[PDB]
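dumping the sequnces here before i forget
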Amino acid sequence: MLRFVTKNSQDKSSDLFSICSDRGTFVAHNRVRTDFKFDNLVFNRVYGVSQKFTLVGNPTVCFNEGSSYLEGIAKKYLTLDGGLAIDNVLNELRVASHAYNITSWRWYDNHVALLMNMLRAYHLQVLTEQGQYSAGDIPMYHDGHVKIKLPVTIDDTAGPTQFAWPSDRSTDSYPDWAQFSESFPSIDVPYLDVRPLTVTEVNFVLMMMSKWHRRTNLAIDYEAPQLADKFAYRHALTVQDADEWIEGDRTDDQFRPPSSKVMLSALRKYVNHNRLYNQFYTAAQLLAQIMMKPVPNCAEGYAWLMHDALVNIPKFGSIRGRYPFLLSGDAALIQATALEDWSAIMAKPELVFTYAMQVSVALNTGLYLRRVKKTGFGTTIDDSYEDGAFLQPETFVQAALACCTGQDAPLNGMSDVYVTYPDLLEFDAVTQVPITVIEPAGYNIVDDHLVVVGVPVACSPYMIFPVAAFDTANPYCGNFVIKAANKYLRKGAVYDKLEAWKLAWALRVAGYDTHFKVTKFYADNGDTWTHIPEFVTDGDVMEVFVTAIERRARHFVELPRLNSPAFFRSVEVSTTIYDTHVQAGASRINLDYVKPVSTGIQVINAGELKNYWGSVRRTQQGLGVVGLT
Amino acid sequence: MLRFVTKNSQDKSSDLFSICSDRGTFVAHNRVRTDFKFDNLVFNRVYGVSQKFTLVGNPTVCFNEGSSYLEGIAKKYLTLDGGLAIDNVLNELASHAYNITSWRWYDNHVALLMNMLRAYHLQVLTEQGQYSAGDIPMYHDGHVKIKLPVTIDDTAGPTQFAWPSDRSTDSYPDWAQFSESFPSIDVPYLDVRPLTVTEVNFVLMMMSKWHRRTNLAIDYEAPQLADKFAYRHALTVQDADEWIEGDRTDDQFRPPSSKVMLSALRKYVNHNRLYNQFYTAAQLLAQIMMKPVPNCAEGYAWLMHDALVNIPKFGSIRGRYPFLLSGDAALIQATALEDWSAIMAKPELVFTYAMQVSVALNTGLYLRRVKKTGFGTTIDDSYEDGAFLQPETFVQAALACCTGQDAPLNGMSDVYVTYPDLLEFDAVTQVPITVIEPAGYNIVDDHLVVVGVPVACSPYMIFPVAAFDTANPYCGNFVIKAANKYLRKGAVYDKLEAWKLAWALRVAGYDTHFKVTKFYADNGDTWTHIPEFVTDGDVMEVFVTAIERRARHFVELPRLNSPAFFRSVEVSTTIYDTHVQAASRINLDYVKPVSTGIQVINAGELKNYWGSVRRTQQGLGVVGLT
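..and the predicted 3d for all of it:
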């Protein structure tokens, strides 16, 4: 995850932003300078381009059965090829079978749900103490023309301002827990080791073991039942503050949730003690992938925002506190990527939020990129693009990321886990958008409802600028030249679709709107980005007519008559970012703090694609899932 | 015109057809086999095509005098040019010597010969039993109902050929009998000695004013050719005189039969040696005769448009002196002589040539309009105003641009059949339309409009027509080539290649769509009109989408639209049997003319317009016979 953010070490550094949001949303400002080079002299415009992101979401959770993983177990009981040694654990058990039949049969170690719960609680408490925790509210689209407003399940103003405990006292049951220090396990039941945790951190862990009530519209407050019906924890001291709060003995005031630092320390201690590096890596990946979506500045863009995601979080199971000697020894085949990403998150916890911000934009753009690159602008005859990585729900987000940006998207590192949108597997997926009553201008409104085909572009690429989405030079590349039209006639300046869009974008930045035929280039002011129109994607057309290029009221850098001969000059456009700052209502990272803990940790760089330890690579032939090498 | 008709197909064929009408219209049926050879798999489909024609028309005729032509007199009575040898005449015979100083020699009988031609054709038509007023066909296509008006109603219209004039209701020429050697008045006289009594009667009485009584194009109105004249005959003929003074009843004095009328024509021409003037008369009659009935809806603008004809005023010096027609006839064109021999061998050469010239004229005008844009033609020649300005070379230029061979010129100066309102490419027509159901049609205010000239016929009376330099459906055969580029939804195609592909698929049985929607092709002709949108400029590529099949399908073909399934389909079309229905093959070796007693010149004079116009590579232009 860290390498993806740093673009494989851009000058061995990158930048991060902490989580901040008001009313469930936050703007993401930018400052850029766009050049215009014609007549061998340079003009420029410095403009502020913003981008709205929202934390509001309602994903569908699926706490179904999942496989077991024993990576953070001592090297002498695990093995790369020999796997789990049941003979060694029976010998060291201290007949054998008499313990086998009791509990030694399950072997269902998996804490992904617990780690995800602790992470989302940390994020929610961060928002709480920043004075910004509240019920979500999706923004409205006021543009004089057709207006969009969406509902929320919980009202913002009545919504809670404080992150209380997820579960509600005196309404639902809790898992039955009791401290357990016996060497010999007695009941087949998850045993989780929390020995080195303080009273408050172990209290927080076992309280988050309970079930989760949703009290807000945010995407990370999803519903979650109790991870285990019964369980026991390996701790020297018997903790019952949570138990006292379960009954009326402890009041709400005296059992307030801890501060963000305490939850972060609890998570660090838990993962370090149980050697849960890969499991936490998967948990962070999933939480970031479900974190948020970008608020569109166009009308048809909200169709992407209407969709809800489906997540496969595995059912919880912990065999690490059953036997004290499991963790005695260096951990077995811990992935190097997991170690470095874990060190990066623990050093800077905002890395997960920044990666979520990058991944939302990359995925939303890459879905459009794949719906276009399948047909290749309609000059691909067969189906030899091999976009099949989009099919299996696990490599959905990874394939979208790889298609949008050339970088290797990081696989989830875990089997039967994914974040997927089932209804958007196919690119000819129609969506309906509830729409208020205002006269139209060619937004193909049907029965007072925007009909949207496929998935729309809903964000500017200004947080991943070198995206290289297209092969040719374009605004996504950043620097491009504007060439003369293919041939000039009465209708005017036959232009190829992609080059026509490039010209339209450059003129819209420069202050001239353009008129097309087979009518203008509806864009956004705040975000002077002009999203690619449907004439590029439809593939029925290959040349387009630009009739007239007019002057907007907000004039800017002056250009000649581009759409006519003897007056056109081959201007070229280059933009650079001056200042970016995610405000609402930064922290530099370099590869100096990446150095992971290698003391008593066996590290394998190689991975097997069966467990999804790899990275999907986009090539010209198409996407492709590649191992970690 | 014999060379033109016998060269449209081959020197051996020489196929002729007789005149036939069915309420003024007739249909010419054909039977044509189309091949489809690809991957050494020859496929074919035999089908019948029908192109109907109409004889109904209302041409405008102007009777304006022109040059005087004397190319039938003896050698000694002519100078080095067409002017008569007045000194030789006088040294042969006085007051006349002094009178001559005031005797202009205007001898031109083209109006008379044309009148006899149209009267003969009308009599043939009425003895065939189908002469009538003539009515335009009523075309209806499920979406649009059209019916062009005609002046004379068919039902009340006469069924028998009445004499063109009335019962002494109008004045008649003051004819006279001449037998002396002294012309008394500068008024023209004729020499009709070899003619019989009834032939002379028909000639003199038809000289009188002609009235238009039917919608037939050859039944145009014409005034009396001369107020006064005399005929040099052995005896006075006065039966038509008794008819005008109101003595001979209609039953005994009726228009003569076709045979005797043609015999009068023959005697007149070959005694006065009017081969050149008769050739001009036949040319004009052929160019005015008929038009094709359009299968497509918008093609009726061709029907509504009326030609303009310039017939010279009637004048005669043949009958003034009796020795002029003696001696060796001088300055007779070989083409005129052979055409005369052929038409008197069979009198329906004029009809078949008229049908061919009608089809060629329509196609030539339409292909001039199309090739203006740049469709099929490399050079942007001055198709608009080059050789179409000269009214006498208008129809010949159209024929040359259509067919590619040498169109025969009128052979006479200041005579033409010209459409003045057709030189512009912006000319519009308001065809009346009762629209049945709305569809793709530019219907504004009860009349659709057309631009320029439309297609109203199909190139089947003349099939091997070489309209374009490259292979095309107009040519015998063409090879469908690979598309310029293939896309997901289809492939782009050049204008001409796309039209060739669409034509071949329509013959095979596939309906072809395109964008920037249908390639129109009516049943009963299965010829695909050039699409309107691709006709204009600034369009060089056509996107072909959705090559769907039709209800009836004959030859099963590859897609030719997808790169995987495209195959080099080579087509070939040949016409096997034609039969008009309201042969008659000619034999050149038996119709060869009389070379004795006639002086024949191969060459002509460009002033008199004795030549032909050929579509050169660099541009069509008039050339001499040499």
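The two ends of chain B are 17 Å apart (CA to CA).
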